[PDB]
Design an enzyme around this catalytic site. Structure first.
Site, PDB file in Angstrom:
ATOM      1  N   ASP D  20      -7.830  -0.953   5.804  1.00 24.14           N
ATOM      2  CA  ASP D  20      -8.742   0.005   6.107  1.00 24.14           C
ATOM      3  C   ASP D  20     -10.016  -0.080   5.568  1.00 24.14           C
ATOM      4  OD1 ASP D  20      -5.886   0.635   6.119  1.00 24.14           O
ATOM      5  OD2 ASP D  20      -6.111   2.636   5.357  1.00 24.14           O
ATOM      6  N   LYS D  77      -6.019   5.667  13.188  1.00 26.85           N
ATOM      7  CA  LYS D  77      -4.912   6.574  13.128  1.00 26.85           C
ATOM      8  C   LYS D  77      -4.909   7.770  13.872  1.00 26.85           C
ATOM      9  CE  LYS D  77      -4.294   5.332   8.239  1.00 26.85           C
ATOM     10  NZ  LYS D  77      -3.043   5.544   7.843  1.00 26.85           N
ATOM     11  N   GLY D 149      -2.189   5.784  -0.981  1.00 21.18           N
ATOM     12  CA  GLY D 149      -3.158   6.053  -1.699  1.00 21.18           C
ATOM     13  C   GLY D 149      -3.027   6.070  -3.438  1.00 21.18           C
ATOM     14  N   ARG D 161      13.223  -2.699   0.657  1.00 20.31           N
ATOM     15  CA  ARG D 161      14.314  -2.914   0.349  1.00 20.31           C
ATOM     16  C   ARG D 161      15.352  -2.166   1.294  1.00 20.31           C
ATOM     17  NH1 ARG D 161      15.430  -6.714  -3.432  1.00 20.31           N
ATOM     18  NH2 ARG D 161      14.068  -7.052  -5.051  1.00 20.31           N
ATOM     19  N   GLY D 210       0.385   1.732  -1.346  1.00 15.48           N
ATOM     20  CA  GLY D 210       0.127   1.363  -2.699  1.00 15.48           C
ATOM     21  C   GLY D 210      -0.034  -0.185  -3.081  1.00 15.48           C
ATOM     22  N   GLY D 231      -4.778   0.084   2.216  1.00 15.69           N
ATOM     23  CA  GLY D 231      -5.615   1.011   2.738  1.00 15.69           C
ATOM     24  C   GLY D 231      -6.783   1.344   1.620  1.00 15.69           C
ATOM     25  N   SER D 232      -5.873   1.389   0.407  1.00 14.48           N
ATOM     26  CA  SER D 232      -7.172   2.108  -0.672  1.00 14.48           C
ATOM     27  C   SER D 232      -7.368   0.899  -1.615  1.00 14.48           C
ATOM     28  CB  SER D 232      -6.715   3.267  -1.514  1.00 14.48           C
ATOM     29  OG  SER D 232      -6.080   4.179  -0.134  1.00 14.48           O
TER      30      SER D 232
END
Lengths: 276, 275, 275, 273, 276
Positions: D20, D77, D149, D161, D210, D231-232
């Protein structure tokens, strides 16, 4: 001038009358001779349907035809709620009214017959004004209370008459602006609510039905404001059917005459036992 | 019929954006951007939400000022059930009354009897039954409620899809099942049948509530609305006059992605809103 | 495809009554009455319901006797999930297998993989999702479940109206909403779309469960069914051969009230059933 | 073009990291670090989460700036159900649309009909049924949702999983039980069977949500993912350009612990999450 | 080479077989003559235990000995769950297998027999893979489903077979790292879970049992993957025991031959009534 108005007018000819359930021609003749305004042709009266169980359906057209041949007064017959083909058959027999009846086994849990699709007038039952108006919107030309059929107990019919009549009276003085919400609360079509308000009464003939067992019962329904009464089980499940049939007819014709009500009640024999 | 005349008046707004405006200058910006009408009010829904307090019909003085400043129709809001606020708005000579849930409810149990008025009314709805109940009361125009002042279109999408979905259900529905459907909707059967016959709502149907971007407005049009209200998303944004024009263009050209790109490009910040 | 051949084969039953029969004489009565097919079984649903015990595939001997007694197609029942009962029935050479809820469930979690068979299957349903799931498993024909053996059509009416009502809803639905509709039906999306495109079930659709009178049968046809099963209502009635003919004629002439009067007149006692 | 063209296109991203980026400079950094694509957006999930408000499609102007700054594919997005945002994004000429739960839901009941578009879509999922429903709607690529995030991979691990585990169960399942399995998954039976026969998801399957460290990214690849979104974790960390290269290396060399040591050594402060 | 492996090997000799409950020597001879691979000696079949109530225990050794004398095929007998002394007695009789059976009255609510303490192989019932593996860890050399014994209804046996088989199939492709948690979820010993994974099947012979009433039922269990079937009530509570016994034997031997399944099912007489 509308086809519905003609049907409504046809049912108005029964005002002041007793409609008697009959299971054969002999009972039909007794009913007519007692002064019934019409007979309800059926194979089993509600007290017997209630006691015996099993699925209760439209009666065999042969037995309806036999009753129709045996009397000159109008003949009604029952169709299961939602069973529009039973109604098609009854109409094709040439009878005068169809009762889309909760006494028979429900055939469609979610929908009643679209009665506007028929030439013959329908009677439907109700417990309250919204239900009456919903049946009328589907095309019922005549309304009766449901009461508690076959019990000989008028308490539910009294409840239903007082409910319908009470909410009609509520409409008379109601703020016009509040009627939209009232129609929603009743789950009833607003235009029929407004028509009831304008008439001060149900837009169709309104009969009492369910548990009428004695002349006193029948005159009580007339004094509460009904146009007539059905008697399904109270006559031919009693000790003296022909006498009680006449007694109930006289009670409806002379419902405000207590001297007459005494006379026709005196020595009347055992009423139907019924269920509390 | 008087009602059909009112219905015809609202139909002149098809293809249009109605913009909430709080003064003459915003009104001029709205008209210059191509709004089909302005909604005159002292506070836009986003501000009513944030500030709280009782929200009422706006001062007739400020409505008259907005009316004098534009030539497009002027709407104004009355509290739900507040038929005297509506009498005042009609007497001002405005063009439409929005009996609005954005203002503080005045009557919890009854809406205004809108048939008592000459001026056409707009009412909000979340579903078809509610739309038809408002129409039976005399609403000549229907909008979704959405969730006003949040800049979030999710509820307006829900309401549009709900109304449109139940209208589509009516089309192929067995006639004999419509009585029960009208009961289930708590809706006047005759209006349900009219809707079935038309294949659409019997009055103009606008999207409203949370429309914040040109994409939002064109989405409502592609979902089938006749127009959109924008209450907060223009003048609570970083570039009101440009966003106002962009949203108008998006509604006029909702099926043209090249245009939607052009009017959205470099538009500045949308309203913050609430999730 | 082989599935499309089975589906095509069942089209010949449209306009027909399928009658449960427990011996060759009843099978001959059914055929002479104009039945389009017979359902061979040791006990009709009313008797299974009354007697209890485990209800299974019928002895191949009695099925062969019925098959030898008639020239119309012969169906027989297998317990739900009992794919070996179905293998046996197929090896007898009958024409259809009804994977039937009237017999005792043999697999609570899975139906027979009917695509593994050459013989076409009938399955029951209560709603469109169930019908489409049965079809995807390979059912070439669908019937309602109704309330088998009660002589009460109320549940069959519910099932017919449910299936037909959702098909009608589906016909007109926004294409973009069909994915969620398929999820809500727990039905295979491709079959949902095929049903949408056809405007009806992709296989023959019969009414079944509680059909007791000619009026009942013609009602199912007027609701939109392709034919009817009668399991108990004929041979649990007072005049089976006459009632068998009457129900066949009612299905043929379902839109003719004069014929329906004629075939219903003097028909004798219907099955008593259970409310 | 058919759906299979879009599915085949997305296969080019296998082995890659998608980063991102909120401006052209970050986009360059991402491309120079070896990202296989960039996700252009005004604010990364960690900031959407922290700042609240309605999160929408980004301004086409900032997306074009990013698309012009790089040669690798550019994604952007759209809110779930916001098919007009997707029409705009497509008309911009970007390469992928992520119909993203990180933005504010626009339609609670329906996703975009992605088969109506020429551009491929990425959708998120938490389980196989969800993935297959998104694919049937036209998603050409699936990522886990994780918990975006947060810098916490626990939900992404759960989702990976879950998807992989049910595919493995499906692969060996009695064919006769698959009808009920598809019902239980609320998934289209035909796609369920296609998955069973293929033995893996019928589209590229990325980890997302994450992923904060090279170890995180390599873990997703060892669990069986085709690639990872970050992303973050990169630009909300101490040294973004170095963490960006390290995560790319970790995804490219996910089975080499010596490399994972090297790229993790002295990497600076991860995102707090 | 281990004593348990020898027991496991002994039960493997019953693969492809039907085990028939018998209550006397005549039934034992019928079972053997019909081709049973073994007989289960007991005083009352499950349908009779279920109907009659009362405490159901190990059968009298005298009646077991009479059955054992009457046949050359192996003889099994039941011990109550947890009743290790009943098992000691059965072993000392010299029979071939002990069924630690839920059909008899539970003797120990919390513990099964420590079957490793015996030389004779045990069969135990199960509803799911974890239960099967727990019984195996206690020393069962053979597993059957529980089904719903004595009902003639196979639905629960189908559930149990599909449960065990389904979870075995789940093991095949399962991430090795996830097996620890799977073993915990199954409440099963991890080493046996891993062995089942390596084998792709239960580490012992796996029979269907409970409600098998018809040849179709028995062939269905074999097609679902079982190694054999128990029939306790379905044969001698049916209209033609010897014929049905042979029919079920043939159905298990030829479970993939629908022509044979038709032949042995044709004219088979009334199956056991059973309970839904």
């Amino acid at each position: 001038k509308s086809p519905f108005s003609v049907k409504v007018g046809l049912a108005q000819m029964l005002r002041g009358g007793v409609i008697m359930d009959v299971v054969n021609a002999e009972q039909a003749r007794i009913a007519e001779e007692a002064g019934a305004c019409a007979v309800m042709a059926l194979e089993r009266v509600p007290a017997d349907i209630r006691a015996q169980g099993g699925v209760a359906r439209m009666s065999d057209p042969q037995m309806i035809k036999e009753i129709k041949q045996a009397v000159t007064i109008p003949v009604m017959a029952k169709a299961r709620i939602g069973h529009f083909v039973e109604a098609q058959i009854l109409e094709a027999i040439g009878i005068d009214y169809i009762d889309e009846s909760e006494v028979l086994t429900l055939a469609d849990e979610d929908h009643h017959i679209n009665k506007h699709n028929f030439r013959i007038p329908f009677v439907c039952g109700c417990r309250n004004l919204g239900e009456a108006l919903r049946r009328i919107r589907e095309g019922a030309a005549m309304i009766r209370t449901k009461g508690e059929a076959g019990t000989g107990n008028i308490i539910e019919a009294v409840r239903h008459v007082r409910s319908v009549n009470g909410d009609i009276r509520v409409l008379r003085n109601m703020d016009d602006d509040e009627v939209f919400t009232f129609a929603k609360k009743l789950a009833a079509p607003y235009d029929l609510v407004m028509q009831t308000k304008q008439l001060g009464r149900l837009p169709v003939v309104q009969f009492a039905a369910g548990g009428v067992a004695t002349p006193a019962d029948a005159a009580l329904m007339m004094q509460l404001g009904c146009d007539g009464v059905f008697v399904g089980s109270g006559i031919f499940k009693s000790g003296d059917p022909a006498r009680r049939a006449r007694a109930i007819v006289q009670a409806v014709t002379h419902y405000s005459d207590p001297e007459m009500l005494v006379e026709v009640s005196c020595g009347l024999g055992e009423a139907m036992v019924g269920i509390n």
